[PDB]
RNA sequence: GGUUUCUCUUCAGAUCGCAUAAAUCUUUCGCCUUUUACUAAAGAUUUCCGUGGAGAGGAACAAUCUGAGAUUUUUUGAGGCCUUGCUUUGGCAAGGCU
């Protein structure tokens, strides 16, 4: 809820780096939510070296972790 | 509404990649309210392995990650 | 399912091509003509009695203002709230041009 | 001029008159019929958006 | 017949139904009918053309 | 005053006095002037203060027709200690019903015109006057002014074909065309759609209804049709959005008639106008005059239109001050 | 069709150049308008309606010019037909005088014309599908039907070209050497018109016979083309030419006691009511008409007018027809004001365009 | 529930979910992605008509 | 997070007014001995009868009122395990397992 809008906007006022159940970092801004958790970021560099993508979506049942 | 910015971006070509580790590079023709999606064109890598050209290539929600073309404004869909 | 001559039995809940019943009313004018006369009548002849009721029945708010309008504002952003934009003519648009 | 209205929020039609956008032309507004054609180009969504 | 012979895609909406409903007082029955002579009017003009 | 309830009240006063003069064997006129030169001015408190006022004009309403408003149609200020009416005593702002502005549109009948749009107004109105004026050229219907700025091998008669004449009508429509120096000329409005609205007159009749009027329809090659009953039943719980909503109700065709009401009876609220501000008669004079009338009623009507012409041309918007 | 004619002039001839200026301009703003010059000096707007030029006349005086500027009175655009075949074979000869070309004019049939006009059938097709589709419906001879040469005054116009020598098929390679020449002579023709330099119409050029010189080089390089213009003249005027004005169609939208009033409207502009039919689930009634374009001026004004604005009319350019008169009898007198009466039609409109544009004497043997 | 419009006579080549690869003439398709196809030749075997559930097929791409 | 009413200040570019008067000046007319008072058109300005928005103060009434606010296919367990290179010691890339 509420809580979700304040990591929408440190992750719109910063890098946001999740980790993903497949072993994978990324980091960079969450633009986007849902109610499935599924979490659509821009300019993202996911580490599983980091190559860097431009938009990424990703579904909510792959993700494991997230912090700011 | 990240499935209303899937459907939004469902012209220029994407690169999806599967919990399998296979991901595959075209253009998609549709996209339904799941993960299910159509793509053509589709230069799909194999799993540590050269890529293959698929004409129609159709995925339930096996995908994990979507690479979004970078036509996505700040308010395209807000 | 909806246009064209074909009736709908409550009883089965089906659509079929025979009309079950006598003064029965086909699909066309008994799911979209008949609530869009009862909109327009709800408006320009109940604008204070049953109209806040029949907006109710829609799921349409309105503040206290809006409805201190005219006749032809109010029933155009009564319209314009239950329909939303115009999606059918870009839906026609891309599916056959 | 529905078109418009839907994309344009702060393009509101007038209560009494009739908004009229794409009679540009002040020959159309006096004699009220349309003279020049007059091309739009906007954006739009579907039902599924 | 201009449309058909600079051979481009065709459709058709109909504009001020509420001149049915205000203006005509006409049952609904009847305004599907005069709906569906519109439609059959304009499929005879383009199989004619 | 609200301006359909002045309206209707002069209405009201229009039939009580057609009545009157209808009625009265001996209408006499009060003498000019009614006190003598040498007679002092009467006392109020002597004379007007203790006497019981005679009765005014006064239509009398049906109780069951006129019902919503019987109370208070003969009030100096009707509705000012209403606050769900009007704004407060100041009385500025109000706001009416639709039951009660048809009872206003219907005893206002007698001064109110039976069009429906601006088609009867095609070259009688006002940029075709304000052309008719800057052209210095009359229609016979409408006013003549003073001239306003006062060879061609054009005008020669050996390359002119005649067939019609070209006349005052066609220069006035279409200005740029038919005349040499057009100067100060505003273009009129073209064709607005036909108000194709009826009229009910009995109420017993369904407010939706085929009237004989209108011609009927007489329709008499296939159509893409999905398969009868081979799947898709509606669910359990769905219907038409206003299927306990009725039809029609007893002010739908009120509401409908009142959509084409004239300029003060088509609102639901508005602004009260001074006394001085309200022309009973305006809507009289704008029209045509009917035939059969005299000459004498011909150039009152014309000379009405010359100072409504003359009214509307000169005039300017108010500075701030 | 852009058919309406309207002249227009300076009022100061000092300011000519600029609106001229501004005619460009609005030739810039309007697809269909034409702008020409004639040989009097004066300038000519073609529209399609009253509407439609006085919005262009209204850009012209306001927006593209300030000039001060005299507009005529609308007139058409006539054409140019026969009637009966040529009563003399007549012919004309080369300045070089060896080759001589006698063709004759006829009429074509209904159809042919708006068949053509509407692309049915092109020069580009197959030579036995064009004499196919000849002869199937027209029921044309399979010597005629090969005979076709060339439509019009120009592609796909109402004229047809049909070459018929049987002396002159044993040079038929020197026929056809001479063919193309004799193709832009017959478009010239009948593009400019020797009535009064309007188009020609529904008329069929039957070659009879060409004696052309063996191997001309010298004197087929160029004389083919006025000769060929002198024996389309020839041959047309010696099939007692008629006038061919416009005609439009009118449909009008009015409430149902007013509809004898719009009759009583075409009973003063030489009209007649094809069709009055009730809309169906309306209170009004369709009438649809045919009127001459020359007395259509102001007739939507009147309309309106005499039915206190309730009957509103639409109007198009549709076909054209045969003026009532004939355009050559020298004995009509002509009243320099007064609206004449059917027979003298033809000869009114010809003497005041012959005077508009060019000379006023006409002479049926002014070629050959 | 809407590619089997596209894919209603094709054959197609299907992926399961334990790594086999199939290819076949699909015939019809549920709701919940059960699809059932014709001639489904195991890649070396065959195995005639066979219906596949929604959570079995990993991915799919069009052979025919 | 009240209404009504009174007064003052400021801004009006909306048909500020779904109504419409008068005056001044400069010219053209008409009447015409001359001057007011006049005729009726244009242009440039004003006055008057009214109006809208915002702010401030006062008085009388309700004293609140009006808001915003889990397993059964595709969003949760098909989860663990040995070997090869790196070990970047949290594991990655490859095989048969269950």
């Given at each position: 809820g509420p809580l979700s809008v304040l990591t929408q906007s440190v992750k719109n006022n910063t890098q946001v780096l999740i980790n993903c159940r497949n072993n994978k970092k990324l980091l960079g801004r969450v633009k986007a939510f849902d109610r499935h958790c599924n979490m659509v970021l821009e300019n993202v560099k996911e580490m599983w070296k980091d190559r860097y993508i431009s938009k990424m979506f990703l579904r909510g049942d792959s993700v494991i972790v997230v912090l700011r | 509404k990240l499935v209303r910015f899937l459907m939004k971006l469902s012209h220029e070509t994407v690169t999806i990649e599967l919990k399998n580790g296979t991901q595959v590079h075209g253009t998609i023709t549709g996209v339904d309210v799941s993960m299910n999606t159509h793509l053509k064109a589709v230069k799909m890598t194999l799993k540590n392995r050269e890529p293959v050209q698929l004409e129609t290539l159709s995925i339930g929600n096996?995908?994990?990650y979507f690479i979004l073309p970078d036509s996505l404004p700040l308010d395209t869909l807000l | 399912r909806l246009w064209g001559d074909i009736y709908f039995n409550p009883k089965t809940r089906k659509f079929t091509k025979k009309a079950p019943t006598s003064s029965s009313q086909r699909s066309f004018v008994e799911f979209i003509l008949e609530p869009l006369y009862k909109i327009l009548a709800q408006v320009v002849g109940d604008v204070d009695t049953s109209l806040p009721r029949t907006l109710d029945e829609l799921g349409i708010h309105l503040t206290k203002e809006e409805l201190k309008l005219n006749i032809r504002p109010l029933l155009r952003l009564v319209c314009k709230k239950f329909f939303?934009?115009?999606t059918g003519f870009v839906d026609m648009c891309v599916q056959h041009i | 001029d529905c078109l418009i209205e839907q994309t344009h929020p702060e393009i509101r039609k007038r209560y009494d008159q009739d908004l009229c956008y794409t009679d540009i032309l002040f020959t159309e507004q006096e004699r009220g019929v349309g003279i020049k054609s007059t091309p739009v180009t906007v954006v739009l969504p579907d039902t599924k958006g | 017949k201009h449309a058909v012979q600079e051979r481009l895609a065709v459709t058709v909406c109909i504009n001020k139904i509420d001149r049915l409903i205000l203006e005509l007082k006409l049952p609904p029955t009847d305004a599907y009918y005069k709906l569906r002579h519109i439609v059959d009017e304009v499929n005879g003009l383009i199989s004619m053309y | 005053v609200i301006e359909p309830v002045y309206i209707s009240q002069w209405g009201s006063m229009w039939i009580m006095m057609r009545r009157e003069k209808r009625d009265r064997r001996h209408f006499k006129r009060m003498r000019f002037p009614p006190f003598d030169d040498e007679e002092p001015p009467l006392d109020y408190a002597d004379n007007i203060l203790d006497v019981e006022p005679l009765e005014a004009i006064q239509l009398e309403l049906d109780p069951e027709e006129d019902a919503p408003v019987l109370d208070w149609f003969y009030d100096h200020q009707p509705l000012r200690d209403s606050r769900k009416y009007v704004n407060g005593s100041t009385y500025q702002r109000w706001q009416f019903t639709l039951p009660m502005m048809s009872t206003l549109y219907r005893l206002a009948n007698q001064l109110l015109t039976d069009l429906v749009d601006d088609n009867y107004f095609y070259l009688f109105d006002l940029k075709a006057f304000f052309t008719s004026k800057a052209l210095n050229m009359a229609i016979p219907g409408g006013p003549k002014f003073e001239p306003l700025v006062r060879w061609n091998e054009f005008n020669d008669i050996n390359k002119i074909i005649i067939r019609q004449p070209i006349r005052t009508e066609y220069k006035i429509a279409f200005p740029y065309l038919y005349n040499n120096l057009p100067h100060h000329v505003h273009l009129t409005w073209y064709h607005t759609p036909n108000v194709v609205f009826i009229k009910t007159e009995?109420?017993?009749?369904?407010?939706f209804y085929f009237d004989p009027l209108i011609n009927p329809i007489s329709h008499r090659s296939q159509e893409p049709l999905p398969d009868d009953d081979e799947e898709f039943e509606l669910p359990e719980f769905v219907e038409p959005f206003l299927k306990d909503t009725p039809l029609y109700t007893d002010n739908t065709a009120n509401g409908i008639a009142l959509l084409w009401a004239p300029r003060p009876f088509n609102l639901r609220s508005g602004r009260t106008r001074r006394a001085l501000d309200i022309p009973l008669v305006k809507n009289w004079y704008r029209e045509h005059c009917p035939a059969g009338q005299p000459v004498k009623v011909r150039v009152s009507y014309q000379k009405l239109l010359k100072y409504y012409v003359l009214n509307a041309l000169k005039h300017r918007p108010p500075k701030a001050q | 069709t852009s058919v309406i004619k309207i002249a227009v002039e300076p009022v100061?001839?000092?300011?000519?150049?600029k609106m001229l200026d501004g005619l460009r301009k609005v030739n810039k703003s309007y697809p269909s308008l034409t702008t020409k010059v004639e040989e009097s000096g004066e300038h000519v707007i073609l529209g399609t309606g009253e509407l439609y030029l006085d919005c262009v006349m209204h850009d012209l005086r306001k927006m593209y010019s300030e000039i001060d500027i005299k507009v005529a009175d609308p007139v058409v655009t006539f054409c140019e037909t026969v009637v009966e075949t040529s009563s003399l074979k007549c012919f004309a000869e080369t300045p070089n005088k060896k080759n001589k070309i006698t063709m004759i004019a006829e009429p074509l049939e209904k159809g042919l014309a708006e068949d053509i006009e509407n692309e049915?059938?092109?020069?580009?097709?197959?030579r036995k599908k064009l004499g196919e589709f000849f002869q199937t419906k027209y029921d044309w001879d399979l010597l005629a039907a090969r005979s076709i040469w060339a439509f019009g005054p120009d592609a796909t116009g109402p004229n047809i070209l049909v070459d018929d020598t049987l002396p002159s098929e044993v040079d038929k390679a020197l026929l056809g050497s001479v063919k193309d020449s004799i193709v832009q002579g017959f478009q010239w023709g009948t593009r400019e018109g020797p009535l009064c330099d309007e188009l020609i119409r529904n008329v069929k050029f039957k070659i009879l016979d060409a004696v052309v010189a063996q191997e001309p080089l010298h004197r087929g390089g160029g004389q083919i083309i006025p000769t060929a213009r002198r024996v389309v003249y020839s041959a047309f005027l010696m099939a007692t030419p008629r006038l061919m004005e416009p005609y439009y169609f009118v449909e009008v939208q009015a409430p149902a006691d007013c509809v004898s009033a719009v009759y009583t409207v075409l009973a003063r502009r030489r009209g007649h009511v094809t069709q009055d039919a009730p809309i169906p689930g309306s209170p009004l009634y369709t009438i649809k008409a045919f009127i001459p374009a020359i007395d259509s001026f102001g007739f939507e004004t009147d309309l309106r007018t005499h039915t206190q604005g309730q009957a509103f009319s639409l109007s198009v350019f549709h076909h054209w027809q045969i003026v009532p008169g004939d355009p050559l009898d020298k004995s009509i007198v002509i009243r320099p004001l007064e609206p004449q009466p059917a027979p003298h039609l033809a000869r009114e409109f010809m003497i005041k365009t012959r005077r508009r544009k060019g000379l006023s004497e006409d002479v049926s043997i002014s070629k050959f | 529930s809407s590619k089997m419009l596209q894919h209603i006579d094709y054959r197609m080549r299907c992926i399961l979910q334990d790594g086999r690869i199939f290819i076949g003439t699909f015939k019809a398709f549920d709701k919940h992605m059960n699809l059932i196809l014709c001639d489904c030749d195991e890649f070396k075997r065959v195995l005639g008509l066979v219906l596949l559930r929604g959570e079995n097929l990993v991915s799919m791409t069009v052979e025919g």
């Open positions: - | 096996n995908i994990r | 939303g934009e115009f | - | - | 009995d109420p017993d009749l369904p407010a | 100061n001839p000092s300011e000519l150049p049915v059938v092109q020069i580009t097709w197959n | -």
